[PDB]
Amino acid sequence: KNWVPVTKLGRLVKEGKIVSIEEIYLHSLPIKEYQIIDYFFQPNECSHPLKDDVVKIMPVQKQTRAGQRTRFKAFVAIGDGNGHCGLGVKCAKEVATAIRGAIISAKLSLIPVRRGYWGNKIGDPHTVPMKVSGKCGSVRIRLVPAPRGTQIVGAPTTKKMLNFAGIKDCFSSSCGKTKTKGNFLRAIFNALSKTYGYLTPDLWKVTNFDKSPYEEWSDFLETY
């Protein structure tokens, strides 16, 4: 709506000098502005609008001279259901505040997962194109693709996370302590992140580069 970005990259997005989040991922630019994501996934106009879910509220306590203080850490999962997941974490003294801060974090956190085929090009992209394994704390979680009709093989937490990411046919497995949920979520998120990190034959081809938004819109960027 009428919201004000104070970053120049934000202001480019606000005007519409940048078409997609994909370009910002291309030039690997830091995102400290939620409005970019809100503009691109435009709730009533979007093809695949971002869907939220508070996965875990946890008590944590400092302990002090005059007694205990309960703070609340909050983990939230957000996803388009098609290709972009986000995992957001905030600790605050008040639960609803924690949840809102986490949702803002989740939008900033927003990452593209690579979706392809298990094998043959006989339908649409539907799962990770290869193994990814992600570690956080004790827990190392491995996603490995399954053939079609083999949707969401894994634990409930994994099912939800893969659904937000838009992954269908895959096996999940795990090593270490699953029970620690924040690490478990993060380990999944780490694996999803690795998907555009692994090299594939299609990426043997030479790469040549579009120029920076900071050079493409330099005059408008000075002006506004």
């Binding site: 291309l26 580069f209 120029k211």
Partner: protein, 72 residues
């Protein structure tokens, strides 16, 4: 769908959300040593920069491109 890109120096793929890797824009000269219109751009991964081999790799790449003559 997202298209990732690779480091010029190492061939290595650069992740989407990494936030440290860079694109180095090098201006071509005009005959009297003024800025020409054209610019050659090269992609440097964060790992090489953290190592501090970026200057050496860049020098090797510039020599291959004929943008430096002294090689090393």
């Amino acid at each position: 769908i997202y298209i990732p890109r690779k480091c010029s120096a190492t061939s290595r793929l650069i992740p989407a959300k990494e936030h440290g890797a860079v694109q180095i824009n090098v201006g071509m000269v005009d005959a009297n040593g003024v800025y020409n219109g054209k610019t050659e751009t090269f992609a440097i991964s964060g790992h090489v920069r953290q190592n501090g081999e970026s200057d050496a790799c860049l020098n090797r790449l510039m020599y291959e491109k004929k943008l430096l003559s002294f090689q090393n």
